[PDB]
């Protein structure tokens, strides 16, 4: 049937739902081609270009994205799709193609399956930010 | 008919003990309950200059208080409602009851 898997950059959280389909990839009910920042278009295209159009042929993935910024949200989609296809296999096909896809993805990029744990450090008094301090006056 | 019990405290240990006691008592009698739902914690922040005279190196105290909330829902008459609450009494816990 279906699986629901999330991807997560700084504060953005994309959730991809996959079921039996015919090759539809859509984020927010919108085509993957026209996600607003076209400069980072290939990051969204990396999983399907690496694996191939024939693996997303019996699967229908719909993504809902919320939080964070534009660049973080784009990075939260390429991870969500990759994780959801890995989760769709090893549950509906076998434990043999999940390994193949997981390897192919993780040699190219580890952030396609593992989330970056970095988050903003809190501001500290006595400076504009976490580390920067105010200019010190002598005489 | 619907009975909403709202619990609010600052000590989560005491508040959770009270909530567990209330839920267990309602299970003990023949009642149907809606489980404890936790509202987001309320964090109140006061930041103050440490010095009383504005002389030193401009250090600041960061003060804060935390308020914990729960909600429980029952379907029972008020006669049945007003036994378990009277059994369990704990300081710092603000129990409130609303009939629909």
């Amino acid at each position: 049937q279906s699986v629901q898997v999330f991807g997560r950059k700084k504060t953005a959280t994309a959730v991809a739902h996959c079921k039996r389909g015919n090759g539809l990839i859509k984020v927010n009910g919108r085509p993957l081609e026209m996600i607003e920042p076209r400069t980072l278009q290939y990051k969204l295209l990396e999983p399907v270009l690496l694996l191939g159009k024939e693996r997303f042929a019996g699967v229908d993935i719909r993504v809902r994205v919320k939080g964070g910024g534009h660049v973080a949200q784009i990075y939260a989609i390429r991870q969500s799709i990759s994780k959801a296809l890995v989760a769709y296999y090893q549950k509906y096909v076998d434990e043999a193609s999940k390994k193949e896809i997981k390897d192919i993805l993780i040699q190219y990029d580890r952030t396609l399956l593992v989330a970056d744990p970095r988050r903003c450090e809190s501001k500290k008094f006595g400076g504009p930010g976490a580390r920067a301090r105010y200019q010190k006056s002598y005489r | 008919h619907r009975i909403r019990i709202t619990l609010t405290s600052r000590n989560v240990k005491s508040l959770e003990k009270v909530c567990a006691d209330l839920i267990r008592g309602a299970k003990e009698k023949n009642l149907k309950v809606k489980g404890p739902v936790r509202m987001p914690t309320k964090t109140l922040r006061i930041t103050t200059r440490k010095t009383p005279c504005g002389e030193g190196s401009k250090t600041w105290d960061r003060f804060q208080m935390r308020i914990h909330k729960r909600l429980i829902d029952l379907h029972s008459p008020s006669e049945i409602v007003k036994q378990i609450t009277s059994i369990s009494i704990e300081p710092g816990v603000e129990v409130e009851v609303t009939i629909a």
Binding site: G29, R30, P31, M34 | -
Partner: protein, 144 residues
């Protein structure tokens, strides 16, 4: 099969919907369009002489996307940055008279009906008119 406005581009669709409204003549244009700015955080008047048609198209698209708005809610949409001299820049808002008389010169089209628990929404005919133009934009994309 068919399309919606979500299946096509938006910067080209607004340019194409704004031309469908300009060729019917039912849209009623205020007397002050040649003089007024669109917000208080803008230094010049809009470059396009037909800004009212483009803004009407953009408001129609926003109403299609999210159902229900108002004059101030449709003024938050077209807000931006105001550069305050030697003081830091700040978020600023648009003009409510424009936000309200683009939302009124769309009831003369029978294309926007007042929302029940709020402001404005889209009519079935208004949904039709946007889908039938998304169709032409998609055809232009496919055949080229």
């Amino acid at each position: 099969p068919g399309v919606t406005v979500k299946d096509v581009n938006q910067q080209e669709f607004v340019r194409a919907l704004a031309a469908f409204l300009k060729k019917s003549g039912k849209l009623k244009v205020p007397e002050w369009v040649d003089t007024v700015k669109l917000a208080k955080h803008k230094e010049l008047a809009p470059y396009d002489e037909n800004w009212f048609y483009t803004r009407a198209a953009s408001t129609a698209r926003h109403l299609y996307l999210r159902g229900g708005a108002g004059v101030g809610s449709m003024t938050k949409i077209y807000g931006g940055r105001q550069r305050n001299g030697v003081m830091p820049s700040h978020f600023s808002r648009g003009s409510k008279s424009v936000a309200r008389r683009v939302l009124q010169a769309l009831e003369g089209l029978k294309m926007v009906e007042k929302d029940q628990d709020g402001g404005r929404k889209l009519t079935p005919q208004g949904q039709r008119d946007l889908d039938r133009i998304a169709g032409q934009v998609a055809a232009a994309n496919k055949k080229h």
